[PDB]
Design a protein around this ligand. Structure first.
Ligand SMILES: *[C@@H]1O[C@H](CO)[C@@H](O[C@@H]2O[C@H](CO)[C@@H](O[C@@H]3O[C@H](CO[C@H]4O[C@H](CO)[C@@H](O)[C@H](O)[C@@H]4O)[C@@H](O)[C@H](O)[C@@H]3O)[C@H](O)[C@H]2NC(C)=O)[C@H](O)[C@H]1NC(C)=O
Ligand SMILES: *[C@@H]1O[C@H](CO)[C@@H](O[C@@H]2O[C@H](CO)[C@@H](O[C@@H]3O[C@H](CO[C@H]4O[C@H](CO)[C@@H](O)[C@H](O)[C@@H]4O)[C@@H](O)[C@H](O)[C@@H]3O)[C@H](O)[C@H]2NC(C)=O)[C@H](O)[C@H]1NC(C)=O
Ligand SMILES: *[C@@H]1O[C@H](CO)[C@@H](O[C@@H]2O[C@H](CO)[C@@H](O[C@@H]3O[C@H](CO)[C@@H](O)[C@H](O)[C@@H]3O)[C@H](O)[C@H]2NC(C)=O)[C@H](O)[C@H]1NC(C)=O
Ligand SMILES: *[C@@H]1O[C@H](CO)[C@@H](O[C@@H]2O[C@H](CO)[C@@H](O[C@@H]3O[C@H](CO)[C@@H](O)[C@H](O)[C@@H]3O)[C@H](O)[C@H]2NC(C)=O)[C@H](O)[C@H]1NC(C)=O
Ligand SMILES: *[C@@H]1O[C@H](CO)[C@@H](O[C@@H]2O[C@H](CO)[C@@H](O)[C@H](O)[C@H]2NC(C)=O)[C@H](O)[C@H]1NC(C)=O
Ligand SMILES: *[C@@H]1O[C@H](CO)[C@@H](O[C@@H]2O[C@H](CO)[C@@H](O)[C@H](O)[C@H]2NC(C)=O)[C@H](O)[C@H]1NC(C)=O
Ligand SMILES: *[C@@H]1O[C@H](CO)[C@@H](O[C@@H]2O[C@H](CO)[C@@H](O)[C@H](O)[C@H]2NC(C)=O)[C@H](O)[C@H]1NC(C)=O
Ligand SMILES: *[C@@H]1O[C@H](CO)[C@@H](O[C@@H]2O[C@H](CO)[C@@H](O)[C@H](O)[C@H]2NC(C)=O)[C@H](O)[C@H]1NC(C)=O
Ligand SMILES: *[C@@H]1O[C@H](CO)[C@@H](O[C@@H]2O[C@H](CO)[C@@H](O)[C@H](O)[C@H]2NC(C)=O)[C@H](O)[C@H]1NC(C)=O
Ligand SMILES: COc1cc(Oc2c(OC)cccc2OC)cc(OC)c1O
Ligand SMILES: *[C@@H]1O[C@H](CO)[C@@H](O)[C@H](O)[C@H]1NC(C)=O
Ligand SMILES: *[C@@H]1O[C@H](CO)[C@@H](O)[C@H](O)[C@H]1NC(C)=O
Ligand SMILES: *[C@@H]1O[C@H](CO)[C@@H](O)[C@H](O)[C@H]1NC(C)=O
Ligand SMILES: *[C@@H]1O[C@H](CO)[C@@H](O)[C@H](O)[C@H]1NC(C)=O
Ligand SMILES: *[C@@H]1O[C@H](CO)[C@@H](O)[C@H](O)[C@H]1NC(C)=O
Ligand SMILES: [Cl-]
Ligand SMILES: [Cl-]
Ligand SMILES: [Cu+2]
Ligand SMILES: [Cu+2]
Ligand SMILES: [Cu+2]
Ligand SMILES: [Cu+2]
Ligand SMILES: [Cu+2]
Ligand SMILES: [Cu+2]
Ligand SMILES: [Cu+2]
Ligand SMILES: [Cu+2]
Lengths: 559, 559
């Protein structure tokens, strides 16, 4: 609970807690639990928000998105998930929530848990809100979240700028009429489709029929509004802009940053930005536009102009009349100009590329199916019925090759990872890389070039060491791996657990694009509570009893 | 020679010859020959127009482009080509010149001739200018034209609008620092690169160093100017526009059309447009912008804003100050709104899709090299030392499978061709299809959609017959096959000969994307003069003697 967070002083929170507190090591002790129940159901012939009926969706509590989780910094969040799907298992991952010493609540099926079985299986997740800001949750059972198993998280806390009104969450997502499993199958042998539409806060107009509605955000004239923008897509990467208005970024993913004013923002799959918008213009209706850059390298939609309306209270109704100017093309790249409020510094002039710190991403066309993604020579394929944690609990170190284990034994040390984007392959695509259990530092990437140009870069220390930044670089949970290039990341090994690190494009992680960082496995075993172990075993027993009865095969990585 | 062609009456030409004359069957007898000599040399470490030195170019008469060929309607054009290259053969194709009953002058090596050998080989081409308008010529010896063996053709004649000043030719081309053979090799196993620059009428500024010059066109205030725009690229497809001005199309390729005013034009590789521009704006300097659409599906450049300067005579010098607005995205499609002055009419209701009128294009990834393009199951591969004409002249009908012969015996009849763009492949690209020996009618294509959307269409008579147009449809020599879709063309068998029909993206035809229409072969043999036969055999004898001594292999289709 806050005691001194006001519109003119958003920096403050409570005694000993403010915007400069190192939230990674210090958390308010509130004693409060916010609980939720997620009832997952399978709905056929569901009428979506743009008027088109979908074959099948999988919904939490009967809505397009699950409950908007809301709590205060230091609260505990507890969610009982009840799987009433017909065939699919499920596992809810809390994206952006680092699960400090709570790895078994990460929701990574095949890694930290077996899936919750259908026809009534249940599991209760319980995690501490040790970071404030805007995050989201979604199923990690193959590409199930593309069917509807997705929602938002708002953990309240201090901010790096004053503002008057918190508009709350604003999820933006691609929308397909085909079901997720259909699309996984299709993308195994075909380039992925454009989205049929892009929903903004749950709604959109159909570009063909005009059915549906624009999201409509009412701004209070003269007021400063915090808007929490998310990209909850399966594939599309968005540029966003508001006609005649700037946006001032105050957080990236769940990391507060120094205020940064911009005309447009790029959001990768899984990324979030908290912005402050001043309703300082003439009262009127203004378009909030979703647009695509990078010449389709990171998505497109069959709706040519997905948009929301921002309406000044007391202005006339109807639609905006100013179409605006197109934003700069972001070329499928997130900005590296954001600077966290609470700083980190690491050396970069000692980095040496080696097999054991390099992660070569490659598209392998030689097998079946056609599109298989490999990291360091292997496409990930996890065992839903024998998760990595089962090996840990049984003291078995014979991890299958397909689990793509990268064991990291270093204790609370900075570790450096060079990710290489198929620089020798026939073609390369941008990939939104996402790390569980940690924020990483973005130390640098290959030079910014047009995303579709097929220019390639291999890390060359004689030119590239000088291009790295270890002095409070961007810190977050998702960032772009440039088409044909490389990305250098660091994270500190402060959190024993098995942590996925994967491209967040659904089709690609389905197709194998992940590794699993096994961080300090010796320490992990000691820190698993009897309750967590017992419940892990309970759910695994039920899943293993269920699986033989499933009418459908597993067709992908499981992730 | 014209006798009544004036600025106020461009429709007139001479007695019995005007804009309405069927130029496909009636030609002025002028008795004039315009002759040229093309001396091809190989130049290492050549300074190009943007300040960058290229490893190797292949030039006609020591210049970036060969002679502008200029003649009148009904003149004869004669060109002696002398091949002073070190290793390569050569063969000059006159793109847009239909070569009516002069098939052996078409310059298609492996089809209508053997290549002219290096170290001083020579051959004289002679053709009747039976069409007026703007065309171009280029080597057809693999992708050699990408090294510099390229130039323009202007055959004067009447026009569909009055105008004051003929500004002449304005070729626009992609420009690569890498030589053509290196790019063929690269594109056999890799997606093609963006161009390093785009030259406009021979020049460009370097996007990195600022070296070079903008093309500078001086407009006479209040005057109507004809500008002859061409795309002489190896791969890039261009959108063009002039800030604050419209352009009125008066011809498409070599076909005069009813005046059509537009804000921007899409030019496929090998396409031409004659436009009339009125200098009716405020006297100033205006940008002529080259832009890319279709989400990089039909090319891009590492120069983000290639442009030329249009200067009003009497205005200040220096650079334009208005950046203007981006044109409509043409989505890699030429317009089907053009309507030829001299009409043609064919039935479309009666078309039935059959194997013998369908040309399925496919990318085959299963062989060596990776990218091989096949039409109706076969990647074309010509024999430079045994051209199709050699088979004709020796009465040999055992054409190799790889010559992709489509024999068309119909005498002077309309023939209908459905080209299908790999609708069941994993990934499809737009292709600029070009026919030798004829203009074709563009009867229809699959629905216009975003080029990178990967939406696929298979011809369906129940919906598509109604979407065809046989009432004076666009008529020209090059048009776009839509990504993932289909294109229906028609041509009349009025010209016996062996005629290539191929994608004009150099990398694609090199990789096999062509067929060879063998039109009325019996009539063809009857029509070959003893002079044409003796000279064909002469060059073949020389080429065949040369080839065993060549130090390099043939690594592609030969075309
Ligand atoms: C999780 O639950 C999902 C929802 O029930 C399961 O997805 C189903 O999985 C099966 C088996 O993989 C699919 O069946 C195959 O579908 C293809 C394509 O059929 C569809 O599309 C074509 C072409 O447009 C159309 O003609 C059909 O009407 C379908 O709409 C067929 O060709 C195959 O023969 C086969 O039937 C289902 O399509 C798929 N359903 C959906 C809605 O995604 C999934 O398997 C479950 N996962 C697990 C691990 O239990
Ligand atoms: C027509 O004349 C052309 C001009 O001489 C001939 O083109 C040459 O063809 C040869 C044989 O294929 C090429 O040699 C190959 O080059 C590749 C790639 O080398 C590249 O990379 C190195 C550095 O890594 C660089 O030094 C080069 O410049 C290239 O960029 C090699 O991997 C092969 O082993 C082989 O050497 C020539 O590169 C190519 N030259 C040019 C300028 O294009 C062509 O073969 C002639 N055609 C015929 C049929 O006679
Ligand atoms: C922001 O989003 C808005 C709303 O989607 C966009 O407005 C739309 O702009 C397009 C393109 O200019 C308009 O379509 C055009 O309609 C006219 C008919 O008047 C027609 O000439 C064209 O063929 C074209 O289809 C569309 O009317 C308009 N939508 C609405 C509801 O006003 C706007 O372009 C977006 N701005 C940016 C910078 O992305
Ligand atoms: C038509 O072609 C011209 C000439 O290439 C284009 O003008 C160029 O426009 C770009 C984009 O606005 C300018 O680049 C920008 O410059 C500013 C200021 O230096 C810089 O802050 C940006 O980072 C960016 O580099 C460029 O100055 C300008 N070129 C010149 C010589 O004036 C124009 O955009 C084209 N128009 C269309 C519709 O394509
Ligand atoms: C996003 O859409 C939701 C719809 O759920 C909006 O939340 C509703 O807002 C209206 C008006 O303020 C209230 O009557 C409802 O009680 C709200 N519903 C819920 C479930 O919270 C929300 O305002 C939208 N966000 C923005 C920024 O416009
Ligand atoms: C967006 O929402 C607002 C409600 O906040 C609507 O604004 C009202 O519009 C009506 C007329 O349409 C006016 O009578 C009211 O006075 C407006 N209220 C406020 C608070 O300003 C607006 O119409 C909505 N826009 C759309 C497209 O539905
Ligand atoms: C990627 O795979 C290679 C194997 O090809 C790994 O390289 C080995 O790493 C181990 C452990 O550090 C060393 O003991 C060996 O010397 C390496 N073998 C070779 C052939 O170099 C590499 O560690 C893997 N990288 C990651 C990050 O997982
Ligand atoms: C484009 O060409 C025109 C015509 O040569 C140049 O126009 C001259 O500009 C100078 C000033 O630089 C004047 O003194 C002349 O009187 C102009 N001539 C005419 C006929 O208008 C122009 O400078 C060139 N532009 C560029 C960018 O070099
Ligand atoms: C494409 O290839 C197919 C297969 O070789 C050709 O189809 C044959 O055409 C002949 C002549 O009409 C028929 O007698 C055969 O029945 C066809 N065979 C099959 C398997 O259908 C077809 O003609 C080729 N098309 C073109 C345009 O060259
Ligand atoms: C791996 O699957 C894909 C294939 C694509 O198609 C190709 C392409 O198009 C951009 C260019 C070159 C090769 C491609 O693969 C067949 C494009 C994709 O991007 C959305 C893509 O994800
Ligand atoms: C889940 O929701 C369905 C549909 O509303 C309902 O019938 C069922 O009882 C719910 N089950 C649980 C455990 O909440
Ligand atoms: C250890 O795990 C491997 C791989 O799953 C398995 O085959 C083996 O039997 C396990 N051993 C024990 C003792 O559990
Ligand atoms: C061709 O040009 C070269 C270089 O200019 C010259 O030396 C040579 O003599 C010319 N050959 C002929 C036959 O024109
Ligand atoms: C093109 O360049 C040529 C030669 O450099 C020049 O004579 C001609 O005027 C230019 N054409 C135009 C339209 O500017
Ligand atoms: C046709 O040409 C091939 C290749 O040169 C030859 O082997 C064959 O004998 C020729 N047949 C006839 C009928 O001349
Ligand atoms: Cl996470
Ligand atoms: Cl031609
Ligand atoms: Cu996620
Ligand atoms: Cu996550
Ligand atoms: Cu990816
Ligand atoms: Cu994940
Ligand atoms: Cu050509
Ligand atoms: Cu041609
Ligand atoms: Cu092509
Ligand atoms: Cu050709």
């Amino acid at each position: 609970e806050p005691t001194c967070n006001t519109p003119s002083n958003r920096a403050c929170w409570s005694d000993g807690f403010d915007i400069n507190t190192d939230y990674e090591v210090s958390t308010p002790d509130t004693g409060v639990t916010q609980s939720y129940v997620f009832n997952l159901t399978e709905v056929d012939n569901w009428m979506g928000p743009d008027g088109v009926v979908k074959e099948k969706v999988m919904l939490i509590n009967g809505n397009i998105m699950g409950p908007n989780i809301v709590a205060n910094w230091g609260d505990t969040v507890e969610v009982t998930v009840i799987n009433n799907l017909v065939t699919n298992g499920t596992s809810i991952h809390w994206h952006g929530i680092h699960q400090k010493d709570t790895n078994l609540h990460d929701g990574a099926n095949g890694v930290t848990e077996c899936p919750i079985p259908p026809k009534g299986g249940q599991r209760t997740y319980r995690w501490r809100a040790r970071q404030y800001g805007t995050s989201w949750y979604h199923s990690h059972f193959s590409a199930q979240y593309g069917n509807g198993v997705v929602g938002t998280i708002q953990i309240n806390g201090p901010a790096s700028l004053p503002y008057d009104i918190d508009l709350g969450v604003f999820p933006i997502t691609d929308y397909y009429y085909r079901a997720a499993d259909d699309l996984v199958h299709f993308t195994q042998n075909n380039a992925p489709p454009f989205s049929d539409n892009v929903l903004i806060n749950g709604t959109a107009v159909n570009p063909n029929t005009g059915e549906g509605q624009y999201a409509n955000v009412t701004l209070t004239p003269g007021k400063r509004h915090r808007l929490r923008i998310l990209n909850t897509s399966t594939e599309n990467h968005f540029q966003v802009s508001l006609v005649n208005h700037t946006m001032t970024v105050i957080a990236a993913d769940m990391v507060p940053v120094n205020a940064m004013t911009v005309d447009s923002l790029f959001l990768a799959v899984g990324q979030r930005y908290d912005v402050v918008i001043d309703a300082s213009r003439a009262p009127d209706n203004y378009w909030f536009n979703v647009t695509f850059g990078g010449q389709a390298a990171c998505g497109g939609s069959l709706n040519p102009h997905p948009a929301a309306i921002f309406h000044y209270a007391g202005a006339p109704g109807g639609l905006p009349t100013d179409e605006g100017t197109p934003p700069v093309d972001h070329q499928c790249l997130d900005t590296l100009d954001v600077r966290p409020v609470v700083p980190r510094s690491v050396p970069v002039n000692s980095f040496v590329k080696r097999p054991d710190n390099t992660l070569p991403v490659a598209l392998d066309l030689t097998g079946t199916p056609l599109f298989v993604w490999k990291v360091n020579g292997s496409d990930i394929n996890v065992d839903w019925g024998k998760p990595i944690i089962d090996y840990i609990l049984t003291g078995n170190t014979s991890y299958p090759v397909s689990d793509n284990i990268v064991q990291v034994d270093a204790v609370d040390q900075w570790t450096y990872w060079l990710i290489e984007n198929d620089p020798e392959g026939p073609f390369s695509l941008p990939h939104p890389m996402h790390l569980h259990g940690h924020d990483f530092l973005v130390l640098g990437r290959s030079p910014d070039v047009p995303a579709a140009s097929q220019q390639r870069f291999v890390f060359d220390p004689a030119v590239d060491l000088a291009r790295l930044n270890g002095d409070n670089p961007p810190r977050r949970d998702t960032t772009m791996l440039p088409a044909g290039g490389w990305l250098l990341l660091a994270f500190r090994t402060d959190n024993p657990g098995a942590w996925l690190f994967h491209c967040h494009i659904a089709w690609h992680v389905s197709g194998g694009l992940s590794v699993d960082f096994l961080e300090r496995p010796a320490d992990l075993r000691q820190r698993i509570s009897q309750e967590d172990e017992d419940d892990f075993n309970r759910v695994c027993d039920e899943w293993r009893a269920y699986w033989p009865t499933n009418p459908y095969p597993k067709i992908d990585s499981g992730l």
